[PDB]
Write a protein that binds this ligand. Structure first.
Ligand SMILES: CCCCCCCCCCCCC/C=C/[C@H](O)[C@H](N)CO
Ligand SMILES: CCCCCCCCCCCCC/C=C/[C@H](O)[C@H](N)CO
Lengths: 41, 243, 284, 240, 95, 240, 41, 48, 50, 48
């Protein structure tokens, strides 16, 4: 968490991201489907 | 109140009237795998009566010039009983054990056995080659119910001396003091579940340190029987039979 | 109301011990029934007779250190684990990372069955006449499954994903830290088993004792240049065990060593543990 | 000045190291960010998306025929349809997926998997299929009475044209080294043999040769440990 | 056919146990995946025109190109390193 | 920058040194720990466990006979049975123990010791033994009236088949350098001669040659100071 | 007690252990024996 | 890292200098002190 | 160069490339001739109290 | 090795000169007709 320059891009790697959001790639549909039901009815 | 004991596990029970004590291996009891240490995602089977009982192996006659013996666990029980059928249908395996080595002799006999439990007991080959090289056969590494006699008991057939082998869990069968040794062993492995066919965890070893001597006229046939019993055994990964 | 029988601890206790134990003063015992000298070794326990109950002792406040004997201070001393020979003029050299080849650090590690540690490698690279020539080297780490380099200037040295270290011969030696990289929960040095299923042979089964949870990869080295320079090298790799935990102690080796992966010995020449003397009834 | 003394590791260049470096342009303010849809945050968003396996990777197909599994009406019962190993990171059908190509950048995968079968026959054709996963300890099952003992899902053809067998995580170790084939068969995971449950029954004037497109992804507890280089790439020049 | 992936979890296919999972999902992020420096260009200088140029294009070497072709748009900072040697290995005191 | 000036000890590599080093894999999270029984925390847990001495280390035994001490019925009284030095770190019977092999990795031991004798005769054989420790200043005692002056424990054979002589810590210095034999006999510690107290008395039809297995460990105030390499090892190759 | 990296394995040796538990190797028996008594009765 | 620049007096060995040095034996605890009579503290006890 | 410290009882090296130079337990210092001179600290190592 | 699979009690000779094997009640029916030997081996009970 240290930097010796005033330029913010000369620093090391920043804090960890820890998030992911897979619902935009796995299930990108309008009618949200459940698990325990038939997807086509 | 200390020389008399009874050990009831399952539908079987062992009495003794000339015992010494009971040894827990490394101060712990065999238990089931907790949820914070499990890595499989299926539900295990736990028969708990049909597989936790005293199985009696065959008897080994102890003579003047015996160099000693070793079994592999759970190798000896992969073909006996319902423990032998649950360890073939299932890929995964976890259990403890409870061992008991009976050897009686009269008041005019003398000698001593060393009954120890060696985790991850690897058999060495016996050649002066630096690479080909000699390696032990499959009936020498995984002997089964008939055990295997040592060639060099002074180095435990692994280049490691017997004089320091009291660091393992052990008892003695001194024929003037007791007639039986009992060792209770938990599950000792680097993984929570492991296969019961490829990997034998530990090996029971009975080596006569001081030899059997008796005056003339006494009973010449002194056998050594071994009665073992799984404790808290559970299996996983159902499939077809592989022996 | 339903079936009833569906409804149906340890021994040791650790204490933070700083210095060695003291000694309390004693007196003389003249009474029957209470005996501390008689033991029974058949129970699998060691003797618990303290020296206050054998003789008459004094009061000693003991201030000796029990710090250097722990398993962290015993294994955090770096020793040689491998020597990589590079003769330039195939141009490179590899080394399968296996520390069971040198005997100073192997016998210390064979006291225990399971060990869980971090490491700290150091690469001391010299020439064959002593060293210190200003050429630049590259040390790759090839994990299991990654393509090993097949040439002096092959494309596996681009090194876009796996680690690498650039250092000259005339710099101080390179030094990194390596985590616990095993898929199991401990490195086991003795694996009584076979890696695969099948019919295992009787004559020569070269797979008995092979533990694949310990094979950690390949260490490759070349000289970063285009034309083949002509100079013979040796690296020496020093591993320091740190943050170390150990389980299940076992006896120490007493026979002379033979192969890396297998605990072989010769049975025709078994060396005795204690060197001989004249008779049993004299001490010198 | 401050009395310092140098340590080993001086003047080296570790590639994966995390340190600062002197900037070339002081006072630099870059071009402002806009909103671009579809930002990834980790690679486990990409290993959960179903992509097509090449189950029919024989020496006869040679093209886009390689992606699909043929079914037809059988004369005998009990028969087999297809089979493949379960090893992301092994040569075979998994090599043409996002799971099987990201698990080659990483060593030591862990977690469950899932295989989705889609049926691309006609509407009037009916049938049932048995999809069986068998854990390691033996060779590929020789008949249906042996493969029924493992994990299996019976699938009926109908209006819902897709089933999904979820291959569980059954292992002794926490991680499997993702390199296998020789002495590394300690880390293998099993087979997904497809068996005919009943038959492929079809009315007249309807084609009697249908296909199945097989898909593959990873479950919610899938991880990957050690980053390495992939073996799918060669180069012998500089690409002038 | 709906363009979505399967959502069948393994608790609804078989009978499972309770597993408190403690594995790390840290090394798989896009920062820890791309912060590993690899070769992007080799500049050849033979002195005796006396200099050499290099158009900065990292699409010429294939170890780091294929990692970068997983995505369409990328926004990053860089950190260059120049390892200069001679043709016989290096280390001659010239500036 | 910060004006620094370098000191001697720059650019060296001390093997036992305690410093940081740059990691090769950032973001690494290892395989989780499980519970494995029998964890050690220091080596003084291992030096308290009784292991067998080789008191009968003559040139005649050659095997597992080396571990045991013979007794029999004597014709004369006052007789001697066995003898050995008290020196963890000296050639002799202590070399085949965990105490005598861990005290070779360390210099300068300190503290008490204990020797446990187990009798492996028959039940009907009786007898008594004298076990005497004598501090340094002289040669091995020549008769029982001389060895009775030192520390001694009289042991009666019976149902409790084991006695334990606790060798005390009698020294001038706090530590004994654990290398002895030449001019280093300033650090020797004494002998544990075994004497017949009465006899080995035996009824008829009972064997008249019994054995004793001798054991050895360390007490609760045992320490070890300076770590060094052991001398029990040789090597002349790379172990190809 | 210092570290210059975010990775916990790049640090020096940690704090001292100071504990030992010899009762699991020396006396691993069920019926706990005293000192001043006969171990077999 | 921290941008430093070196000064004269770099890499020298002054004999009377007062600086730290890396220990060879970690975790070392020496032999305890006892009372020995007649301890000096300075050399002006000897010049009197 | 390599400077070992051999405590009393440890095996002294018997060759230029012998196995006692593996140095897995006792201290050692690697330093070139062209570096600044090596410098360590040594505690009170006597078994007596002075 | 076959008789060890059933209910068994291991008996050590000693000062207590008597053991007792308790044959349990293992049956399908609540009662066994106490006449057996022919087709009435449906009601047999076992060997000791
Ligand atoms: C540029 C850095 C290259 C050097 C990095 C080496 C990392 C690999 C080290 C893994 C940990 C030690 C290897 C395993 C220890 C033992 O040799 C094996 N268990 C052998 O049984
Ligand atoms: C003395 C310092 C000289 C080196 C400074 C180099 C600065 C220029 C780097 C710009 C950022 C990377 C260049 C662009 C990346 C890819 O090659 C292009 N997008 C090619 O498509």
């Amino acid at each position: 968490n240290i930097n010796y320059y005033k330029d913010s891009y000369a620093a090391s790697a920043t804090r960890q991201d820890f998030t992911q959001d897979p619902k935009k790639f796995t299930q990108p549909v309008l009618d949200s489907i459940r698990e325990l039901s038939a997807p086509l009815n | 109140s200390d020389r008399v004991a009874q050990l009831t596990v399952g539908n079987s029970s062992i009495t003794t009237q000339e015992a010494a004590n009971i040894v827990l291996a490394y101060g712990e009891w065999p238990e089931y795998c907790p949820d914070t240490d499990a890595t499989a995602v299926d539900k295990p089977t736990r028969p708990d009566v049909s597989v936790n009982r005293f199985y009696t192996l065959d008897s080994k006659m102890w003579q003047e010039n015996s160099t000693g013996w070793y079994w592999k666990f759970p190798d000896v029980l992969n073909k006996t009983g319902v423990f032998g059928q649950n360890a073939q249908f299932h890929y995964l395996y976890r259990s403890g054990f409870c061992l008991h080595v009976q050897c009686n002799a009269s008041k005019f006999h003398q000698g001593a056995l060393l009954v120890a439990v060696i985790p991850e007991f690897v058999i060495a080959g016996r050649g002066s080659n630096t690479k080909e090289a000699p390696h032990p056969g499959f009936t020498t590494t995984f002997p089964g119910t008939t055990g295997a006699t040592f060639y060099d008991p002074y180095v435990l057939d692994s280049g490691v001396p017997l004089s320091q082998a009291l660091i393992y869990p052990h008892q003695w069968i001194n024929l003037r003091t007791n007639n039986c040794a009992t060792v209770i062993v938990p599950y000792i492995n680097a993984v929570p579940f492991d296969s019961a066919i490829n990997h034998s965890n530990f090996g029971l070893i009975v080596i006569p340190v001081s030899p059997l001597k008796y005056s003339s006229g006494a009973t010449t046939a002194i056998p050594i029987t071994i009665t073992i019993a799984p404790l808290n055994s559970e299996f996983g990964g159902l499939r077809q039979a592989v022996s | 109301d339903p079936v009833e029988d569906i409804i149906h601890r340890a021994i040791s206790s650790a204490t933070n011990v700083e210095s060695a134990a003291n000694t309390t003063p004693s007196s003389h015992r003249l009474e029957t029934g209470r005996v501390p000298a008689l033991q029974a070794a058949e129970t699998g326990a060691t003797s618990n007779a303290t020296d206050e109950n054998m003789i008459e002792t004094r009061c000693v406040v003991n201030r000796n250190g029990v710090l250097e004997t722990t398993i962290n201070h015993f294994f955090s001393r770096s020793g040689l684990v491998g020597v990589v020979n590079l003769t330039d003029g195939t141009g490179y050299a590899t080394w399968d990372i296996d520390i069971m080849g040198f005997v100073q650090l192997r016998r210390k590690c064979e006291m225990f069955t399971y060990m869980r540690f971090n490491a700290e490698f150091t690469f001391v690279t010299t020439t064959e006449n002593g060293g210190a020539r200003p050429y630049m080297l590259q040390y790759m780490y090839v994990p299991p499954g990654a393509p090993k380099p097949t040439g002096r200037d092959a494309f596996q040295w681009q090194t876009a994903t796996n680690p690498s270290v650039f250092v000259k011969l005339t710099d101080p030696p390179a030094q990194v830290s390596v985590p616990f990289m095993s898929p199991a929960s401990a490195y086991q040095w003795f694996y009584d088993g076979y890696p695969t299923f099948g019919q295992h042979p009787e004559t020569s089964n070269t797979t008995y004792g092979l533990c694949p949870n310990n094979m950690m990869g390949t260490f490759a080295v070349r000289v970063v240049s285009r034309e083949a320079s002509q100079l013979k090298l040796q690296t020496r790799v020093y591993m320091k065990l740190k943050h170390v935990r150990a389980w299940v102690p076992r006896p120490i080796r007493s026979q002379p060593y033979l192969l890396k992966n297998f605990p072989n010995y010769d049975s025709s020449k078994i060396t005795n543990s204690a060197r001989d003397r004249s008779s049993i009834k004299q001490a010198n | 000045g401050i009395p310092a003394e140098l340590r080993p590791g001086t003047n080296q260049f570790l590639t994966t190291d995390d340190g600062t470096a002197a900037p070339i342009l002081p006072g630099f303010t870059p071009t402002p960010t806009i909103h671009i849809p579809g930002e990834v945050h980790s690679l486990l968003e990409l290993c959960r998306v179903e992509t097509i396996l090449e189950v029919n990777n024989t020496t006869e197909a040679t093209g886009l025929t390689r992606l699909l599994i043929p079914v037809s009406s059988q004369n005998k019962a009990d028969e087999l349809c297809a089979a493949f190993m379960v090893d992301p990171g092994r040569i075979g059908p998994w090599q043409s997926t996002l799971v099987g190509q990201i698990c080659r950048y990483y060593t030591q995968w862990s977690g469950s998997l899932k295989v989705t079968f889609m049926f691309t026959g006609s509407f009037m054709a009916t049938g049932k299929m048995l999809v069986a996963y068998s854990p390691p300890g033996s060779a590929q099952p020789a008949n249906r009475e042996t493969a029924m003992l493992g994990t299996h899902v019976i699938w009926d053809f109908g209006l819902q044209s897709s089933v999904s067998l979820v291959i569980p995580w059954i292992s002794n170790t926490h991680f499997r080294t993702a390199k296998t084939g020789g002495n590394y068969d300690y880390y293998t995971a099993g087979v997904v043999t497809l068996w005919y449950q009943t038959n492929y029954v079809v009315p007249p004037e309807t084609p009697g040769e249908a296909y199945i497109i097989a898909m593959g992804a990873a479950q919610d507890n899938f991880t990957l440990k050690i980053c390495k280089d992939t073996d799918e790439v060669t180069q012998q020049a500089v690409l002038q």
